[PDB]
Paper text:
Using 10 µM Dabcyl-KEALFQ↓GPPQFE(-Edans)-NH2 (↓ indicates the cleavage site) as a FRET substrate, we found IC50 values for MG-78 of 6.7 ± 2.2 μM against the EV-A71 3Cpro and 1.45 ± 0.40 μM against [name] 3Cpro. Crystals of the EV-A71 3Cpro complex with MG-78 were grown in cubic space group P432 and yielded useful diffraction data extending to a Bragg spacing of 2.07 Å, whereas the [name] 3Cpro complex gave crystals in space group C2 that diffracted to 1.65 Å. Compound MG-78 binds along the substrate-binding cleft in both proteases. Similar to the situation in the coronavirus Mpro, the nucleophilic attack of the catalytic residue (here Cys147) onto the α-keto group of the α-ketoamide warhead leads to the formation of a thiohemiketal, with a covalent bond between the sulfur of the catalytic Cys and the α-carbon. The amide oxygen of the warhead accepts hydrogen bonds from the Gly145, Gln146, and Cys147 amides of the oxyanion hole. The carbonyl of the γ-lactam accepts hydrogen bonds from His161 Nε2 and the side-chain hydroxyl of Thr142. In the [name] 3Cpro structure, the contacts to Leu127 and Gly128 are more relaxed. Instead, there is a rather short distance to the Arg39 guanidinium group. The two nitrogens of the P4/P3 urea unit donate hydrogen bonds to the oxygen of Gly164 in the EV-A71 structure, whereas in the [name] protease, only one of these is strong enough to be called a hydrogen bond. Whereas the crystal structure of MG-78 in complex with the [name]-[name]-2 Mpro revealed an ideal fit, those of the complexes with [name] 3Cpro and EV-A71 3Cpro demonstrated some steric incompatibilities that likely reduce the inhibitory potency. Such incompatibilities are more serious in the case of the EV-A71 3Cpro compared to the [name] 3Cpro complex, in remarkable correlation with the inhibitory activities of MG-78 against the two proteases.
Residue numbers in the entry: 1 to 180
The structure:
């Protein structure tokens, strides 16, 4: 209830639809002109953001201290408008909740909200054959079209949807220290 209300407002204010050469994704703006995509969006020097051409000033593919994959790409966007600063809503470590909402904003799943239930700290996963850490797990059969999906609870942005195995979905944890 409060989680759906939080998610609708979060997506209204900070989400957009992005097309890269590698497909269509939900993109979350974090602060200033920094957004996050799943790494496998592989954003070029230019992106479509809500059907408009936008330049990518910088692109950091995130890895932990061992160089392990986190499956997140931070993007600096060449635009005048700035994102509402949502770093306050990002945890310092992986959040587990009994009740989460996954919010999608593409052409395929426009403004849809999925109650995914319990989110558990999964940690390690071989994702696309790349070892990956900091994975949050929910028992939902996620499909193509949901990557970049934003995983939320009341007052919390928990992570970005990056993968599934047909029965479970996995989000990369969106941790505060990524955006210092
Ligand atoms: C996402 O890009 C999208 N278009 O929505 C997509 C979401 C997937 C597709 C089917 N279910 C989902 O939630 N993500 C991917 O395709 C990522 C991408 C490539 C592989 N990948 C996967 O999620 C794969 N899973 C996987 O590696 N399976 C394990 C090994 C964990 C058993 C797969 C096989 C495409 C579903 C990369 C770069 C991680």
């Amino acid at each position: 209830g409060p989680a759906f209300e939080f998610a609708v407002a979060m997506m209204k204010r900070n989400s957009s639809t992005v097309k890269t050469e590698y497909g269509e994704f939900t993109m979350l703006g974090i602060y200033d002109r920094w957004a996050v995509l799943p790494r496998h969006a592989k954003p070029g020097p230019t992106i479509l953001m809500n059907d408009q051409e936008v330049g990518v000033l910088d692109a950091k593919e995130l890895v932990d201290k061992d160089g392990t994959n986190l499956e997140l790409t931070l993007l600096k966007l060449n635009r005048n408008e700035k994102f509402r600063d949502i770093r306050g809503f990002l945890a310092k470590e992986e959040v587990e909740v009994n009740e989460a909402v996954l919010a999608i904003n593409t052409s395929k799943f426009p403004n849809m909200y999925i109650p995914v239930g319990q989110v558990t700290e999964y940690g390690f996963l071989n994702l696309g054959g790349t070892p990956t850490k900091r994975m949050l797990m929910y028992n939902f059969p996620t499909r193509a079209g949901q990557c970049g999906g934003v995983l939320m609870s009341t007052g919390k942005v928990l992570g970005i949807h990056v993968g599934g195995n047909g029965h479970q979905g996995f989000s990369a944890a969106l941790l505060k220290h990524y955006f210092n």
